[PDB]
Design a protein around this ligand. Sequence first.
Ligand SMILES: *[C@@H]1O[C@H](CO)[C@@H](O)[C@H](O)[C@H]1NC(C)=O
Ligand SMILES: [Ca+2]
Ligand SMILES: [Ca+2]
Ligand SMILES: [Ca+2]
Ligand SMILES: [Ca+2]
Ligand SMILES: [Ca+2]
Lengths: 394, 394, 394, 394, 394
Amino acid sequence: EFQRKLYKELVKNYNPLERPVANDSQPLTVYFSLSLLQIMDVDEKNQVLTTNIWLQMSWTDHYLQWNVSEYPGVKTVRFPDGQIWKPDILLYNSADERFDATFHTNVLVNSSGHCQYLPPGIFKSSCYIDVRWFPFDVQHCKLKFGSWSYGGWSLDLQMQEADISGYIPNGEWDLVGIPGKRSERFYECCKEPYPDVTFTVTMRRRTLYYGLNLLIPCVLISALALLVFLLPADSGEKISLGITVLLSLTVFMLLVAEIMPATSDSVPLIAQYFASTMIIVGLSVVVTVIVLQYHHHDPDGGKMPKWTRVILLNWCAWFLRMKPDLAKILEEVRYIANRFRCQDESEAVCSEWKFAACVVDRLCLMAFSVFTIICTIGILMSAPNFVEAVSKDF
Amino acid sequence: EFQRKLYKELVKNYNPLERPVANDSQPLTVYFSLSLLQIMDVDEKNQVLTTNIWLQMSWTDHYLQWNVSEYPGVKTVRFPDGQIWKPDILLYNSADERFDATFHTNVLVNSSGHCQYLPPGIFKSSCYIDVRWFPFDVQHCKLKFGSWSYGGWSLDLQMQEADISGYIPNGEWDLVGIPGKRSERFYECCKEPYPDVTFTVTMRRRTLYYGLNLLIPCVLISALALLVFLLPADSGEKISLGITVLLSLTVFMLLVAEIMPATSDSVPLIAQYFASTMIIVGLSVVVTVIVLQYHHHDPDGGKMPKWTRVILLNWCAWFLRMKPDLAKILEEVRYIANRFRCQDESEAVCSEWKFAACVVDRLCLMAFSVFTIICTIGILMSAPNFVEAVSKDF
Amino acid sequence: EFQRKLYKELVKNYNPLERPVANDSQPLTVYFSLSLLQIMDVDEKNQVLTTNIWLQMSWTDHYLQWNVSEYPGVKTVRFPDGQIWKPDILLYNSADERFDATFHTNVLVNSSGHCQYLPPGIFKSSCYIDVRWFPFDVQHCKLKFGSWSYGGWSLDLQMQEADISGYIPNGEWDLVGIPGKRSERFYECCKEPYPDVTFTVTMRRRTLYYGLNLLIPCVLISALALLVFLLPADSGEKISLGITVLLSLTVFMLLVAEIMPATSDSVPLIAQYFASTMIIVGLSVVVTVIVLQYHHHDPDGGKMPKWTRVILLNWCAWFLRMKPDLAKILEEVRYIANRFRCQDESEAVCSEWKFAACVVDRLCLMAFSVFTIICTIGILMSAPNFVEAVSKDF
Amino acid sequence: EFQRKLYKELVKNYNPLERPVANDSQPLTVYFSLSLLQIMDVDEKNQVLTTNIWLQMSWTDHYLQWNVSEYPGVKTVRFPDGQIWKPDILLYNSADERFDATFHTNVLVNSSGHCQYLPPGIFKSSCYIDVRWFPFDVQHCKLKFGSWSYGGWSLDLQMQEADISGYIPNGEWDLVGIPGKRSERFYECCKEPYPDVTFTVTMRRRTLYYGLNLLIPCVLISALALLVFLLPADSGEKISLGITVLLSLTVFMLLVAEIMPATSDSVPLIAQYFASTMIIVGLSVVVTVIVLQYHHHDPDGGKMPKWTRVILLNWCAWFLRMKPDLAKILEEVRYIANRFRCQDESEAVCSEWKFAACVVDRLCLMAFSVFTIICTIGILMSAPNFVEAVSKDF
Amino acid sequence: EFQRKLYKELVKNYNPLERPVANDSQPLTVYFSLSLLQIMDVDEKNQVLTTNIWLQMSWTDHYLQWNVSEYPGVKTVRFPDGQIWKPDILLYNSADERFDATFHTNVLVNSSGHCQYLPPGIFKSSCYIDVRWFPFDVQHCKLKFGSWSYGGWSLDLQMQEADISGYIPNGEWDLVGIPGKRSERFYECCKEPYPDVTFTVTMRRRTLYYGLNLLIPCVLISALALLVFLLPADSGEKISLGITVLLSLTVFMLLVAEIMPATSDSVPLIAQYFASTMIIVGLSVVVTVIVLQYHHHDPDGGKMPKWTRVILLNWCAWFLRMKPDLAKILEEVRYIANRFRCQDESEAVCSEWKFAACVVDRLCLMAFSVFTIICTIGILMSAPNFVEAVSKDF
Ligand SMILES: *[C@@H]1O[C@H](CO)[C@@H](O)[C@H](O)[C@H]1NC(C)=O
Ligand SMILES: [Ca+2]
Ligand SMILES: [Ca+2]
Ligand SMILES: [Ca+2]
Ligand SMILES: [Ca+2]
Ligand SMILES: [Ca+2]
């Protein structure tokens, strides 16, 4: 009886085109805020943040006011899209093909004209995603909101603190906070300035998944590449082991190339770590080739340079703690035995060259172990957020 | 004649904005429920549940009432979207870019004003998908529904049991049940509380497909890694077999990484099982390198430590039940034979070192077999739902 | 002059809400049918059938009637969506995010009120896709259609034979037929029953593509695995060949896992055939390891069990049709020759062990050939539709 | 002043439902055509042609006529969708989920009532894509257009030549032409026939990309498979080379399987060429196994059949142009030398068997070279359009 | 009070169909421009440029004028889509399924009738993407804009400089500039010409990511292929190394084939560089086979041609700076020693053939190093933009 009469009196002469203020010269105050429910996806390749957000706009409408004594029990009214004036607040850095992803809902309005409008939405926004320190990265994704066509002389956009009380954690991102800032900017379109309200979502990557799928797999494969330095040369499988580990390393390099944006603003930390690992395994194949040359050295070839027999077989070999008819028979058997003696001297030279290969294996075992550890530790702990990651996520 | 007259009388002065109650101060009771027809997809990567649902809302409309004696044969009427008041019940945790995925249909209304509204829909909802016990997991996906803009003082949302009579089974998920609960919650938006009705779909993963594509393939590949301990060392193919099985293991690790969400709330069971398997095969490559060092040991190198000739060649080798001119000719032939004797002693030392490699193969064959069985059995039967899975799905 | 006057008289007092019958108590008869133009896609992973369909609804409208003598040349009229009453027939098992995929078009209406409505559409429907016999499978995909909100007391849905005259064949599916059936069902929503009309599309998979991409590639790779039994052991490439063929077999297992739905209602025929093939190649690697143990057997190790020298070197080797100073010189040369004699006896034992490996190769060549043929033939001809496939598609 | 007055007079009593003809009994002539701007994509897997098209419809409207002397400067008027009658011409073989992909724009109308309507659009259409001769294929994709609900007694659809003046070439398809044909067909829906206008886009695949990504890579890999016949047997890498080239061949077979539709209307040319190449490399692995059996033949085994020592070591080896105490010492040394002599005869037999392997390598080098060339040339030049391709694209 | 009165007076008799000019014979001037905010994506495979753009249209409306003295404080008004006349400016080369991707917003209008309309949008446009010089390419993507249905006699489209003040850099593309040009063209549709305004976005690819993911990985793999020329032949791993590096090269060839459009307008620079690298590694496998033939040459086979013993073992070997009863015993031992002597001469011939293989390794090491460097440098520095790339991006 009363709800029917109010809806009829409130729409008399109403115009959703008119900005709802008593004095046309003043700007209309609009308080903007939002509630962050869920971070659905951070698309590092497309540089897009997907979020589930309820936006919160509130203002006063001069013409949507009634006396609750004259409409008993009628304290709030509701209006759908197009039936009352709303602020046309849009996400400026939308990455949605439709641009505006807001699902339109009612505007709630109480008897003093106070209007509340909380349209839900799944929003996609453009966010520079800084992959310099990935997977130990912190991202600061901006969500810029402002009236599209109402400047500051017409619409006084004000900011209120973001709501995270109903926020649902994500398993890949720890929300650090959603600080906001109201700015007043000029655009070359217009002489009037246009206020906006930007919310910056500070979200920290959780690193357990990436530790177990990217960082830890790489360390063990790096350790496998050092088993080439422990394989005997006579096994015949050093290059197979080494080059196969190297082919195992490209699957990870393509996994990173597939998830990282194709940008030149910097080189990700993961890229520097995988590139260094692949250069340490790629250099262990180069060293393996040199080792095999020493092991398979032709004894009747060039003698061992004196610099080599001291640098390897003395210094490094100490540091590593390795260490008438009867005369014709005589002539003929002497040839057989002398042939054996020549084979022993050639064999001794071969064993001497083989021992050099063993020393080079041990040296480059130690050398590549130090390179792996320092590069692994140095690259990973160069990230500002590495210590925080191992404390919280491990 | 009568259907035409009723549709004309029923819309006189009607307003789809007005909540349809006789006394404005009372809230309107709305019974919400749903019918689960089909679970279309559980997206574990995007944390999204897709379902085919008919929602069921029912209420009374004070103004949609007629006397069937005055409209003979006219017992029900129908109204499309926007022509009569409806409750704006929305899925709160929608994951649809449009947010609201409901296909709007008629509202059926009989002569006493009882309104029935059953819009079908394909819904996408946000569901925390707990992959801790995957593939023997049970999921509890919530579907939260409530009026967006009508609080409890206006809309008394009530719950009714979910319908599963027309439910069509899925081959990957056994519906355990769809219990629902009506809750009354406060939000920082509003001083009035807002009732909602949540339905939790309890669905058990069926594990035959994952047994045959993830778990069983892994067991056999684990068994293949133990064939390296049975390959003779002289074959020249131990590292090839071992490292190739290890490269066969990464295809599965990338298959899991591709279907699992990138989260740090826990490590899936499948991840722990594949990671342990890859550490058992990766450790069989380390042990294989040690075996080859023993087999290819230089006889003129360091002698065998006394601890090694007892631990392996006595204890473990028993447990495993393995086990003037004529003088110049004399001098020259004595060298040939003594050279042969030195070769036999060197060969005996080599065979002794080769026998150690064989014992180490058998020990690590048994040791890695126990590790594989205990890790396989221990990790799999640590799942609460493993026994149920093998009973129902196998 | 007359078309303008008819469109004006026909809309006087018309209501698209009113069901178009003269007697409100009777149900309106609606004949439903469809024309199948093209099967666009059978999505076995998502269990979705895509089809290009024109639906065919026809009924009578009491108020859309004129005398063609009074409107010369005006024999048919046309009305767009929302301007005249239509039946709200929907696909019940729609898999489209919008649910209703029908493109709305005109309703044609002649002078006696007969209405024809043929909206085209690309439809996606939920279809249980039975992959038990894939790729020799026949599918029976249902398309359930009925009025959403009009029960049987209001809408007498009747069925007419499906049109396939304009059907365009697909290269993967031979349409067997589109039988339909009208059913009358009750739902827990409603006390009134709701008729529906279901069309079952019986479509046979054409198997040439899958013969050439799945079945034939697998047979040849199975034959390659038997070449390991023909490779000499001294080549050093048996495990490389065997395990490489095994790695070639996983690419196919992942191709099947990617196109098959992740369901536990059964194991596909292709899964049983590839799993058996991979178990025959995986068992040829196990047997290869045993062969290499025989070939590389240490002659100074355990002697050959008497059961082995009869089972292999007699039975199977027949079946397969294989088959003062002068005394010091004397002492020293006798050692050299006796050392040679011991080497010959050790070599004879080695050749004896090598011959056992050759016999085992031939036995397991024959044994695995029979297993491959019987498993290949047995699994493939266990399909009811295998004989039909080779007759029609090959 | 005049544009305002014309828009007001022209809509008086106008009805967009009425077909715009003076005599209702006559059909309305509509000239249909189109402008082909760009071929966006030919989807061979989904059998869908995407094109950027402007459609061109023109007709006369009896009621949209004015005297330009009475509306000075007003020579054309414009009307948006729904405000004037339009022909409901649709693409019949649309593959778009919405079915109708036309972007609606104004209808231009001059003073004699002539209406021009050029809606742009991105269209997806169903096109049988004949992959028999891929990548040297020519496709004839039909675009069928006709009024959905207006038959020939109401709408006289006429055809005009297609415009390609603003056509923008594509790098994969050379437009050969867009011939059109107007047809008059009957459908089982209706007793009246329905004219349509079909345009067939004849487009020739440009083959440079596919020459460099499919055909040329395959030829070189085929040539690599012949290097197995040049590898010495003592290298120990024949199977590794051969089987690795075979694994290199499957990456291409899966690339083709991924881009080709899963159809059984024929076997593509590329499929026959890759299948023959893989059977020539797969047969070079079989022959390699036979070669290794000859090379590793046990000298104490079965003698060489006389047919083998003539067919290979005579004929083919000519064609290929290959080619008291002193008596105890005597007894003992005679054994040593006779043992050497037996080793030489066994070695001579081994070298004889090794020479057979070399001849078989050279024969099968020549034989597989001829097979590769004839199969490569024969399969490729069996395409009708191969000569055109190498002339235009190379 | 005044905003309400202006919105009411301004819509009296207004028609959004009427072009807003005082004199109908004159064309309406419209200034078109745009603001480039962000380049979202350059799709080289689909030939589509995605951009975030605000379009800027401005014109005068004769009927939207008021005296601000009569409406105090009312200086601007706003109108939504369909309520006032707008120019129907469309992107001509749109690649969006909807064609028009513009998000409609208000038109701002001040008291002298000046209208400003800045609809945002995410636009997809067809752009010929010239991949000839990829990854050192510069692209010139056109965005053609014009009124769809208003020709030059009605709509005088004028151009204004593009705004890039709010442009946000992209990590893959450096915006070089957005020059625009206004053109007046004729179309076969129409006798009247139709102005358009085209903006060409000149964007330079940033090459760090592609240097590290495509170019640098390829160089090192090319260097690895040269390690085959340093591996000793006795290692038994030359083909394994060589062919494995060749299989490592196909992963890159498929990565390029996946991101490049399938076009025959040219061969990309990356394609020529990878194809040359794969032909240098593929030719190092051919040369490796020849080397192994020399190393494994049968000493009892054909002698070394005199041309070979000079070209390799003299010239190239200097350039490279490589370098009664007692008579029976006598007869028997003479055989043993003469057998040894024959083995030494055969061994000397073998070592001579082995030395040739070593020289060929060193020659082809140097030769392939020069080929790699010249092909690497020559192909890369043939790009006009290579020097700019290394200066700016490295
Ligand atoms: C505008 O109105 C004011 C007061 O009503 C008047 O003085 C002024 O002349 C008007 N301007 C025009 C251009 O008519
Ligand atoms: Ca992420
Ligand atoms: Ca699932
Ligand atoms: Ca299919
Ligand atoms: Ca194509
Ligand atoms: Ca790009």
